[PDB]
C-alpha cells in the first residue's frame, strides 16, 4: 500500500506489536522522523521501502524518494496536530503554535504531549497541507513537553 | 525486515476539532545530535 495518508510505524521485535512512531505518505514517499526508524528499511505489506534521504540533526528521513513536504506555518494561524497515538484512533488537535527561537531563526512549536510512539505525527495547516512532523522537542520548567514543527526542504 | 507501516487515516483538517495547548516562546539550541535544549 502506498496511498497518501498517515501511517503507524510498528515493530514486532519487542513485546507484542509496538508502535514506535508515525509518518506521512505523499507523492509516493514516506516521511518520518529519524529517531523513529534510525534509518532502517521498512516493510509495507509484502513490499519494502528503502531509505532515500535523512539527516540526524534535522531528525528526519524519507523513503522511496526525496522529501516532498514543503508547506510551512504562516506564523499567525492555528494548526492541527493529527496525532496518531499507540493503540488509539487518529485525532485532530487544533492549537496556536508557539515559537522555538534559535541562533539560526525561529521555528513553530506545538505544546501538546503524547506518548513517544506518536513521533512523526503530521501537523497541518487549514488547507490540509503538512507543515511538519511532531516529536522532536524540549521539556520546560513546568515539566511539560513542547515539540518543534519539524519540516524538511523540498 | 523488522519495522512495518499500517495506514491510519487521511490527512485532513477537521472542522470541529478540539482546540487546546498554549503558545510558548522559547530560546532553544539544536545540537549536532538533533536534540533541542533550552538556552539559559
Amino acid at each position: 500500500e502506498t496511498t497518501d495518508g498517515v501511517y503507524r510505524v510498528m515493530t514486532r521485535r519487542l513485546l507484542g506489536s509496538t508502535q514506535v512512531g508515525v509518518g506521512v505518505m505523499q507523492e509516493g514517499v514516506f516521511h518520518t522522523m529519524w529517531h523513529v526508524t534510525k534509518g532502517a528499511a521498512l516493510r509495507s505489506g509484502e513490499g519494502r521501502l528503502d531509505p532515500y534521504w535523512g539527516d540526524v540533526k534535522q531528525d528526519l528521513v524519507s523513503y522511496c524518494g526525496p522529501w516532498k513536504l514543503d508547506a510551512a506555518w504562516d506564523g499567525l494561524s492555528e494548526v492541527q496536530l493529527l496525532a496518531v497515538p499507540p493503540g488509539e484512533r487518529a485525532k485532530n488537535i487544533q492549537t496556536l503554535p508557539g515559537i522555538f527561537k534559535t541562533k539560526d531563526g525561529d521555528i513553530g512549536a506545538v505544546a501538546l504531549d503524547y506518548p513517544a510512539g506518536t513521533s512523526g505525527s503530521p501537523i497541518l495547516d487549514k488547507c490540509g497541507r503538512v507543515i511538519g512532523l511532531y516529536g522532536n522537542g524540549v521539556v520546560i520548567k513546568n515539566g511539560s513537553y513542547v515539540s518543534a514543527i519539524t519540516q524538511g526542504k523540498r | 525486515v523488522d519495522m512495518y507501516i499500517e495506514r491510519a487515516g487521511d490527512i485532513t483538517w477537521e472542522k470541529d476539532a478540539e482546540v487546546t495547548g498554549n503558545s510558548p516562546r522559547l530560546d532553544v539550541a539544536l545540537d549536532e545530535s538533533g536534540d533541542f535544549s533550552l538556552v539559559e
Binding site: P115, N136, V139, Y145 | F36
Partner: peptide, 6 residues
C-alpha cells in the same frame, strides 16, 4: 514526551 524529548 514519555521522560524524554522524543
Amino acid at each position: 514526551k514519555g521522560x524524554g524529548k522524543k
